[PDB]
C-alpha cells in the first residue's frame, strides 16, 4: 500500500498520459484527445521531431496507409512490425512532451487500436521525460487478452441488457452489482481449453500478473530495438535473455513440482507435439487457432519453416563444435567474455546481433518462426489479417504450454554452450573471514485471494456514455498469494566489510523422491532477493522481510485508484520504481497442507562496486558479477560447501481452499486463510 509524492505539474501531465487508455476500443467525439487530434496537422509537423528521417519514413508509409482499425495487430508479422516501429520512432523522437502528446492523440484517433497501444506503451517506457510516469496495468489496457471468453461474453450480455434480467438469477451466474459497478467472478479454464494434465496449473499460466510480467519484459527491451539507449548495457543484453527465461522456467518448474507434474517435455520439428491447447479467445474475424493434442508439426504448411528452424539450431551446434569462428562480421570465441552476450542475441535474433539500429524485415528470426509453427494457425490471409494464437502476443504467450516448451529448448541450448565457461573455483567463491552460522525462516504459506480489475476496455459504450469515460465492468478472480515472512541470517565475521547478500529458492527432490544434486539443480533455482549490508566484525544477525525482496512487487492499482491518488498528489511507488518485476503474489509456488519441501539458498560475498548501470530493467547488483550469480553457469558442487553459503530446507504450506474454483461458487462461503 506504499506511495510517493508528486506535484501538480506531474499530476496534470500524468493525467494526460492516462487519458488515452479510456475506452480504447472506441472514440469519444467529445474528448480532449479528439480535439488535439483534429487540430494536429501531421503533414505540417516535420518540426515536432528531432529526427527528420524517421518522420519522413512515417509520412511515407502513411501516404500508402497502415493497418486498418479492427484488425488484430501483432509484432510478429512483418509489415505491421515496420509500421509499429515507425509509429514508435515518431513517439520517441518527438522533441517535447507537447509534441509527443499531440502525436499520441493523433494515433489514438486515426490508427489501429492495437498498434497504437503497443507503441504508446513502449514510447512512454522508453522516452527520457516520460519514464518515471506510471502506466495502467497491461490487463486493464488489454482486457481482451486477460479475460477468458466465458466472462468476456457474460460482459457483452450484461452491457446489452444494461444490467441483469433478474438480480438473483445472475447472482447464480456469478454476476454482482457492487457500488454501482458490475463484478463478474471468473474461474480458470476447463480441460476444454487445457485438454491434458497441464490444466492442473491454469491458475499460474492464466494469471494476469504473470502475463503482464512477460509483456513488461518485452516492452522494456523489444527484440527489434537496439541497445543504444542503455549504453554499456548493450554488452550485457544476451546475458539478460538467458537470465530472464532460465529464471522464469525455474519458477514454472516449481509449480509443476507441487502439482505432481514433473519435467517440461522435449519435442521435435519432425514429430507430433503431444500437448495441445485451445486458446479461449477470439479476434474481430477469427476464433483463435486451436492446437489439439498430438498435433503434427511436420506437414506441408510447415515444411519450409521447419527447414529454417532446424538449421538455425544446428548451426548453433556447429558454433559449439568449432570454438572460434567468424560469424556476423565478428570473430568470436566462446571462452571470451563477449560470448554470453553473443549466444543470447543469436537465439533472440536481436537488432544487436546485426548492424541494426532497428531490425530489418528480411532477417529471419527463430522465435518468430517457432511461434508460427507451434501456434498451429492456418497461414495468414493477407499481411494485415492473420489467425491469432496465444503465441502471437506477449500478453498471452505464457498461457500456452508450448511457450515453456520452446524457451526451455532455447535455454537448454545455451546451457549446452555453458560447458565452454570456466566453473567457479574454490577461493573464487570463498569469502575470507565470513561464515553463515545459521539461517532461520518464518512460516512460508501460500493461499488464494480474490483480485479485481476493470475490464471496461473490452466492453462497448453509447455515444452518450462515452462522455463520462465509463468504466463499470470488473473481473474478480482468485489469484495465488502468500503471507509475508522473514528470513533471519546468523553471521560471524573477522572484519568489517561490505557484503552482498543473495538468497535463491529452488527444488529439494526429484519426482522420484531423490535429493537433486547441484550439478543438475543449478538452473532450477530462482533469485528471490539481493542486497548490500555493512557487516561488522563479530557475530551479527541480518533480518530480511519478504516485503523488501528485490525481485518482487505489489499489485498494480487500477487506473481509478491511480487517479484518486493523484487527486491528493501521490503515485503508487511500485508502479513508479519497478513495474517490470514479478508480482509478489507469485513469489512462492502453491504449497500443500503437508508443507512442500524446497531449498532456500543464502549466499554472502564481498561487495565490490562498479559505476552504476543505466538500466532497462530490474536494478541488479552494482557488480561486475553476472546476472544470477553464482548460479549463472554449471557448478562443481564441492566448491559449493563454503562457510558463506547456506542451503536450508524449507516447507511451503497452504491455507484455506486448495483450488481457486471453490471461491466462485454462488452461496458457498470458502475457507479463507487468516
Ligand X SMILES: *[C@@H]1O[C@H](CO)[C@@H](O[C@@H]2O[C@H](CO)[C@@H](O[C@@H]3O[C@H](CO[C@H]4O[C@H](CO)[C@@H](O)[C@H](O)[C@@H]4O)[C@@H](O)[C@H](O[C@H]4O[C@H](CO)[C@@H](O)[C@H](O)[C@@H]4O)[C@@H]3O)[C@H](O)[C@H]2NC(C)=O)[C@H](O)[C@H]1NC(C)=O
Residues that bind its own copies (CB under 8 A): 64, 265-268, 270-271, 298, 300, 303-304, 307-308, 310-315, 317-318, 320-324, 327-329, 361-362, 364, 382, 412, 419-420, 517, 638
d(CA 280, CA 389): 10
8 Å CB contact between 175 and 164: yes
Q: What is the DSSP string of 165-217?
A: SSHHHHHHTTEEEETTEEEEE-----TTTS-SGGGGGHHHHT-HHHHHHHHHH
Q: Considering only CA atoms, which of 626, 378, 423 is closest in space to residue 518?
A: 423
The nearest distance, CB 197 to Na ion, in angstroms, is 10
Distance, CA of 49 to CA of 87 (rounded, Å) = 12
Contact flags string 220-239 toward ligand X, x per CB under 6 A = --------------------
Q: Is 638 in the site for ligand X (CB under 6 A)?
A: no
Q: Please count the helices (runs of H) and the strands (runs of E) in the chain.
A: 22, 19
Does residue number 665 form part of the binding site for ligand X (CB under 6 A)?
yes
Identify the helix (H) or strand (E) that includes residue 150.
Answer: helix 149-160
Name the minimum Å distance from CB 224 to ligand X: 23
Closest to ligand X by CB, 138 vs 174, is 174
- Residue with Cβ nearer ligand X (598 or 653): 598
* Shortest Cβ 68–ligand X spacing (Å): 4
Q: What is the DSSP letter of 78?
A: H
The H or E element spanning position 333 is: strand 331-333
- HSE toward the beta carbon, residue 239, CA cutoff 13 A: 21
Q: What gap in Å lies between CA 52 and CA 93, rounded to an integer?
A: 9
166 binds ligand X (CB under 6 A): no
- Are the C-beta atoms of 410 and 416 separated by less than 8 Å? no
- Nearest distance in Å: CB 435, its own copies: 21
> Which residue, chain included where needed, has cell 451466474?
173
Minimum CB–partner distance for residue 425 and its own copies (Å)? 11
- Please report how close the Cβ of residue 66 comes to ligand X at its closest, in angstroms: 6
- List C-alpha distances in Å: 456 to 74, 152, 447: 22, 10, 28
CB of 295 to its own copies, least distance (A): 16
Residue 23, phi then psi, degrees to nearest 5: 65, 45
380 vs 609, which CB is nearer to Na ion? 380
Q: Does 375 bind Na ion (CB under 5 A)?
A: no
CB atoms within 10 A of CB 33: 20
CB of 397 to ligand X, least distance (A): 25
664 binds ligand X (CB under 6 A): yes
Asked if 254 touches Na ion (CB under 5 A), the answer is no
Q: Which is nearer to its own copies, 268 or 568 (CB)?
A: 268
Nearer to ligand X, 184 or 491 (CB): 184
Q: What, of its own copies, Na ion, ligand X, none, does residue 308 touch, CB below 5 to 8 Å by kind? A: its own copies
* Cβ distance to its own copies smaller for residue 271 or 614: 271
CA atoms within 13 A of residue 253's CA, in its CB half-sphere? 27
Burial grade of 89 (CB within 10 A; 0-12, 13-18, 19 or more): buried
Ranges within 394-413 binding Na ion (CB under 5 A): 401, 404
User: Computed from CA positions of residues 150, 156, 157, 158, in that sequence, does the dihedral angle turn out positive or negative?
Assistant: positive
Q: From CA 108, how far away is CA 96, in angstroms rounded?
A: 18
377 is a contact residue toward Na ion (CB under 5 A):
yes
**β 272-273/181-185 pair status:** unpaired
Provide the minimum distance between the beta carbon of 446 and ligand X in the complex, in angstroms, as a whole number.
20
Q: Are strands 3-5 and 570-572 parallel, antiparallel or unpaired?
A: antiparallel
Distance CA 527, CA 519 (A): 18
Is 174 among the residues that bind ligand X (CB under 6 A)? Answer: yes
Which residue stretch of 320-328, 463-471, 499-507, 658-666 sits at the interface with ligand X (rule: CB under 6 A)? Answer: 658-666
Using CB under 6 A, which of 38, 50, 70, 172 touches ligand X? 172
Q: How far, in Å, CA of 488 to CA of 414, rounded?
A: 35
- Closer CB to its own copies, 61 or 532, in the complex: 61
Q: Which is nearer to its own copies, 50 or 517 (CB)?
A: 517
Choose between 383 and 543: whose C-beta lies nearer to Na ion: 383
Instruction: Output 29 or 317, the one with its CB closest to its own copies.
Output: 317
Q: Does 362 bind ligand X (CB under 6 A)?
A: no
* 377 binding partner (options its own copies, Na ion, ligand X, none; Cβ < 5 to 8 Å by kind): Na ion
Integer Cα distance of 252 and 110 in angstroms: 40
Nearer to ligand X, 321 or 382 (CB): 382
Q: How far is the CB of 362 from its own copies (least distance, A)?
A: 4
- Spatial distance between the Cα atoms of 246 and 238, rounded to a whole number of angstroms: 12
Buried-state track 298-319, b at ≥16 Cβ within 10 A, e below 16? eeeebeebbebbeebeeebeeb
Q: How far is the CB of 182 from ligand X (least distance, A)?
A: 13
User: Are 397 and 390 spatial neighbours (Cβ–Cβ below 8 Å)?
Assistant: yes
Residues composing the chain: 674
Residue tagged 529448448 (cell numbers) = 409
Phi, psi of 94 (to 5 degrees): -45, 130
Q: How far is the CB of 111 from its own copies (least distance, A)?
A: 19
Nearest distance from C-beta of residue 513 to its own copies, angstroms? 14
Residue ranges of alpha helices (H) inside 376-479 are 401-417, 426-429, 463-466
How many residues bind Na ion (CB under 5 A)? The answer is 6
Quickly list H helices, 259-399. Answer: 303-321, 338-348, 366-375
Q: Which is nearer to ligand X, 66 or 245 (CB)?
A: 66
Q: Using CB distances below 5 to 8 A depending on partner kind, what does residue 537 bind out of Na ion, its own copies, ligand X, none? A: none
Site for ligand X in 53-72 (CB under 6 A): 65-66, 68
383 lies in the binding site for ligand X (CB under 6 A) = no
Residue 322 interaction partner, one of ligand X, Na ion, its own copies, none, beta carbon < 5-8 Å per kind: its own copies
In this chain, which stretch among 209-217, 323-331, 353-361, 370-378 interacts with Na ion, using CB under 5 A? 370-378
Nearest CB to ligand X, comparing residues 549 and 663: 663
CB of 423 to ligand X, least distance (A): 18
Residue with smaller CB distance to its own copies, 270 or 593 = 270
Of positions 191, 303, 661, 671, contacts ligand X by CB under 6 A: 661
Minimum Å gap between C-beta 437 and ligand X is 18
Residues making contact with ligand X (CB under 6 A): 65-66, 68, 172, 174, 185, 187, 514-515, 661, 664-666
**What is the binding site for Na ion (CB under 5 A)?**
377, 380, 386-387, 401, 404
Amino acid at each position: 500500500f506504499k506511495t510517493t509524492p508528486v506535484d501538480a505539474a506531474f499530476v496534470e501531465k500524468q493525467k494526460k498520459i492516462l487519458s488515452l487508455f479510456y475506452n480504447v476500443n472506441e472514440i469519444s467525439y467529445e474528448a480532449e484527445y479528439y480535439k488535439v487530434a483534429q487540430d494536429f496537422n501531421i503533414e505540417a509537423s516535420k518540426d515536432c521531431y528531432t529526427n527528420m528521417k524517421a518522420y519522413e519514413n512515417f509520412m511515407m508509409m502513411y501516404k500508402v496507409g497502415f493497418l486498418p482499425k479492427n484488425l488484430e495487430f501483432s509484432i510478429f508479422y512483418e509489415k505491421m512490425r515496420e509500421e509499429a516501429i515507425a509509429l514508435f520512432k515518431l513517439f520517441y523522437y518527438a522533441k517535447d512532451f507537447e509534441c509527443f502528446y499531440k502525436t499520441a492523440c493523433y494515433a489514438r484517433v486515426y490508427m489501429n487500436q492495437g498498434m497504437f497501444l503497443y507503441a504508446y506503451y513502449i514510447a512512454i517506457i522508453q522516452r527520457s521525460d516520460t519514464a518515471s510516469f506510471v502506466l495502467p496495468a497491461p490487463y486493464e489496457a488489454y482486457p481482451q487478452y486477460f479475460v477468458n471468453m466465458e466472462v468476456k461474453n457474460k460482459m457483452d450480455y450484461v452491457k446489452m441488457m444494461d444490467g441483469c434480467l433478474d438480480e438473483k438469477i445472475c447472482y447464480n451466474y456469478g454476476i454482482i452489482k457492487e457500488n454501482e459497478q458490475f463484478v463478474m467472478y471468473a474461474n480458470y479454464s476447463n480441460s476444454l481449453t487445457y485438454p491434458n494434465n497441464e490444466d492442473r496449473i491454469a491458475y499460474l499460466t492464466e494469471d494476469v500478473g504473470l502475463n503482464a510480467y512477460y509483456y513488461y519484459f518485452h516492452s522494456h527491451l523489444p527484440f527489434w530495438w537496439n541497445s543504444g539507449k542503455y549504453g554499456a548495457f548493450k554488452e550485457r543484453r544476451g546475458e539478460i535473455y538467458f537470465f530472464f527465461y532460465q529464471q522464469l522456467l525455474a519458477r514454472y518448474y516449481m509449480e509443476r513440482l507441487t502439482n505432481g507434474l514433473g519435467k517440461i517435455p522435449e519435442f521435435s520439428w519432425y514429430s507430433p507435439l503431444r500437448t495441445g491447447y485451445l486458446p479461449p479467445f477470439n479476434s474481430f474475424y477469427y476464433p483463435f487457432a486451436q492446437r489439439s493434442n498430438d498435433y503434427e508439426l511436420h506437414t506441408e504448411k510447415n515444411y519450409e519453416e521447419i527447414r529454417f528452424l532446424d538449421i538455425y539450431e544446428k548451426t548453433f551446434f556447429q558454433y559449439l563444435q568449432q570454438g572460434h569462428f567468424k560469424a556476423f562480421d565478428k570473430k568470436i570465441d566462446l571462452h571470451s567474455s563477449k560470448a554470453v552476450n553473443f549466444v543470447g542475441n543469436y537465439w533472440q535474433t536481436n537488432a544487436d546481433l546485426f548492424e541494426e539500429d532497428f531490425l530489418q524485415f528480411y532477417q529471419r528470426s527463430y522465435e518468430v518462426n517457432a511461434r508460427r509453427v507451434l501456434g498451429a494457425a492456418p497461414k495468414p490471409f493477407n499481411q494485415y489479417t492473420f489467425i491469432p494464437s496465444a503465441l502471437d502476443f506477449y500478453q498471452t504467450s505464457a498461457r500456452d504450454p508450448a511457450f515453456y516448451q520452446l524457451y526451455k529448448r532455447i535455454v537448454q541450448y545455451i546451457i549446452e554452450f555453458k560447458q565452454y565457461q570456466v566453473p567457479y573455483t574454490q577461493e573464487a567463491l570463498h569469502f575470507v573471514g565470513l561464515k553463515i552460522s545459521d539461517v532461520k525462516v518464518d512460516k512460508m504459506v501460500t493461499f488464494f485471494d480474490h483480485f479485481d480489475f476493470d475490464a471496461f476496455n473490452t466492453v462497448y459504450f453509447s455515444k452518450e456514455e462515452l462522455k463520462s469515460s465509463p468504466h463499470g465492468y470488473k473481473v474478480r478472480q482468485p489469484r495465488l498469494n502468500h503471507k509475508p515472512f522473514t528470513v533471519t541470517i546468523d553471521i560471524k565475521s573477522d572484519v568489517a566489510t561490505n557484503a552482498v547478500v543473495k538468497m535463491f529458492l529452488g527444488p529439494k527432490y526429484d519426482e522420484n523422491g531423490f535429493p537433486f544434486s547441484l550439478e543438475d539443480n543449478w538452473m532450477n533455482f530462482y533469485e528471490l532477493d539481493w542486497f548490500v549490508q555493512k557487516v561488522n566484525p563479530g557475530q551479527s544477525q541480518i533480518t530480511r522481510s519478504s516485503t523488501d525482496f528485490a525481485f518482487f512487487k505489489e499489485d498494480s492499482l487500477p487506473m481509478a485508484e491511480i487517479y484518486k491518488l493523484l487527486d491528493q498528489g501521490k503515485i503508487p511507488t511500485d508502479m513508479f520504481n519497478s513495474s517490470d518485476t514479478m508480482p509478489s503474489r507469485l513469489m512462492l509456488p502453491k504449497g500443500t497442507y503437508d508443507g512442500f519441501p524446497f531449498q532456500l539458498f543464502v549466499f554472502v560475498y564481498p561487495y565490490e562496486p562498479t559505476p552504476k548501470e543505466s538500466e532497462p530493467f530490474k536494478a541488479v547488483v552494482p557488480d561486475n558479477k553476472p546476472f544470477g550469480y553464482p548460479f549463472d553457469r554449471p557448478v562443481l558442487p564441492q566448491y559449493f560447501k563454503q562457510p558463506n553459503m547456506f542451503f536450508k530446507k524449507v516447507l511451503v504450506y497452504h491455507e484455506g481452499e486448495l483450488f481457486p474454483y471453490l471461491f466462485n461458487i454462488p452461496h458457498y462461503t470458502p475457507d479463507k486463510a487468516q
